[PDB]
């Protein structure tokens, strides 16, 4: 696959799964982020929200793996599916390499989803059914009558990355996990972090241990996914699209963050006034634009990124943001 040795035939993110011990707390979060309910499971209280190529699964099955996850962690990403070319080739290798299976209970005439124990114990699914017509959603879900099958929403296209926050000294443990099992490699350049990149060139999972990280671990009651980043081709248009449907972003940087923009990023070319009108951040000629939601699902938040050459994660915005509240 695309990048390097993909002995697991990873083909990108398939879905991410959410659940909440409190009803009606996840549905409005999906809507303000431009996602559309498009299908409901054939027999479980489980729902599919879509935007672009992003599949968001809302799991409200009671007495389930996901509800036990939610009861301990609160509103959360409790599951994460990887696309693979052959789910048995990968499920059996992962167990041979020592992965722990998690049994997801499956109803009659429904698909058996193979899953292993992942970050915080959340299932990591290996799904080899995909595409319109043959995907797991066509088989086990029922689409709403006459609803647009592939909503575009506010222009989020893919999951660009999601992070894991991990306790002090666990990052080598979770780096090993993704290396040994999926042939992830840390990309490496040049707060402590390891950008784990998958051989498919689509899955990126950065790992953080520490403030900001320690507060997540306490509020989340464990390791887990701290933020999911959605890619868009035009963050500025996406920004306006999201704000008109109720999106709440991190409060904008002080204006002095934009005076330095030409200083720290000569000839970036971006309309400075449009980014400042919306508090959009910038890092990079390889460039990227990004902006964050507030914490919406406990301490879990969301990122919206547009890449203009830069393949990083906006790390330079810590120095930029701090040294802007230094002159303001």
Ligand X SMILES: Cc1cccc(C)c1-n1c(=O)c2cc(C(=O)C3=C(O)CCCC3=O)ccc2n(C)c1=O
Query: Residues interacting with Co ion, by CB under 5 A?
Result: 229, 303, 313
- Whichever of 108 and 211 has its CB closer to ligand X, that residue is 211
Q: Which of 165, 208, 238, 324 binds ligand X (CB under 6 A)?
A: 208
Q: Count of CB atoms within 10 A of residue 108's CB?
A: 5
Positions of E strands within 167-310 = 185-186, 192-197, 204-209, 224-232, 281-283, 287-292, 301-308
Question: Is residue 311 close enough to count as binding its own copies by CB under 8 A?
Answer: yes
Site for its own copies in 3-22 (CB under 8 A): 3-5, 7, 22
Q: What is the DSSP letter of 250?
A: P
Q: Which stretch binds ligand X (CB under 6 A): 7-15, 31-39, 69-77, 317-325?
A: 317-325
- Residue 19 CA to residue 180 CA, distance in Å, equals 29
Characterise 270 by phi-psi region: left (phi > 0), alpha (psi -120 to 50), beta (else).
beta
Q: Which stretch binds its own copies (CB under 8 A): 38-46, 144-152, 211-219, 274-282?
A: 211-219
CA distances from 205 to 158, 229, 274, 316 (A): 14, 10, 30, 18
Where is the chain broken, named by the residue before each break, C–N > 2.5 Å? 190, 210, 284
Site for its own copies in 54-93 (CB under 8 A): 68, 71-72, 93
Question: Is residue 303 close enough to count as binding ligand X by CB under 6 A?
Answer: yes
Q: Which two tokens stand for residue 308?
A: 């203009």
Question: Is residue 248 close enough to count as binding its own copies by CB under 8 A?
Answer: yes
Write out the residues near its own copies by the rule CB under 8 A: 3-5, 7, 22-25, 28, 31, 68, 71-72, 93, 96, 98, 100, 167-170, 173, 179-180, 183, 185-190, 194, 214, 217-219, 221-222, 243-249, 294, 311
């Amino acid at each position: 696959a695309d990048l390097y040795e993909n002995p697991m035939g990873l083909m990108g993110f398939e879905f991410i799964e959410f659940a909440s011990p409190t009803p009606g707390t996840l549905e409005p979060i999906f809507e303000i982020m431009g996602f559309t309910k498009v299908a409901t499971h054939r027999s479980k209280n489980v729902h599919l929200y879509r935007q672009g190529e992003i599949n968001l699964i809302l799991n409200n099955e009671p007495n389930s793996i996901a509800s036990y996850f939610a009861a301990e962690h609160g509103p959360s990403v409790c599951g994460m599916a990887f696309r693979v070319k052959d789910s048995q080739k990968a499920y059996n290798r992962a167990l041979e390499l020592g992965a722990q299976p998690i049994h997801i209970d499956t109803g009659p005439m429904e698909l058996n989803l193979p899953a292993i124990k992942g970050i915080g114990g959340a299932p990591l699914y290996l799904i080899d059914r995909f595409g319109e017509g043959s995907s797991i959603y066509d088989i086990d879900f029922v689409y709403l009558e006459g609803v647009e099958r592939n909503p575009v929403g506010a222009g989020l296209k893919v999951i660009d990355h999601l992070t894991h926050n991990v306790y002090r000294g666990r990052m080598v443990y979770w780096a090993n996990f993704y290396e040994k099992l999926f042939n992830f490699r840390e990309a490496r350049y040049f707060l402590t972090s390891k950008a784990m990149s998958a051989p498919d060139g689509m899955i990126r999972i950065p790992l953080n241990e520490e403030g900001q990280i320690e507060e997540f671990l306490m509020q989340f009651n464990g390791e887990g996914i701290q933020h999911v980043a959605f890619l868009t081709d035009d963050l500025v248009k996406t920004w306006d699209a999201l704000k008109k449907i109720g999106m709440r972003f991190m409060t904008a940087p002080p204006d002095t963050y934009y005076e330095m923009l030409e200083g720290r990023l000569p000839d970036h070319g971006e309309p400075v006034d449009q980014l400042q009108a919306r508090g959009i951040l910038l890092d990079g000629k390889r460039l990227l634009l990004q902006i964050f939601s507030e914490t919406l699902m406990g301490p879990v938040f969301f990122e919206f990124i547009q890449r203009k050459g830069d393949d990083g994660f906006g790390e330079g915005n810590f120095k930029a943001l701090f040294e802007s509240i230094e002159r303001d």
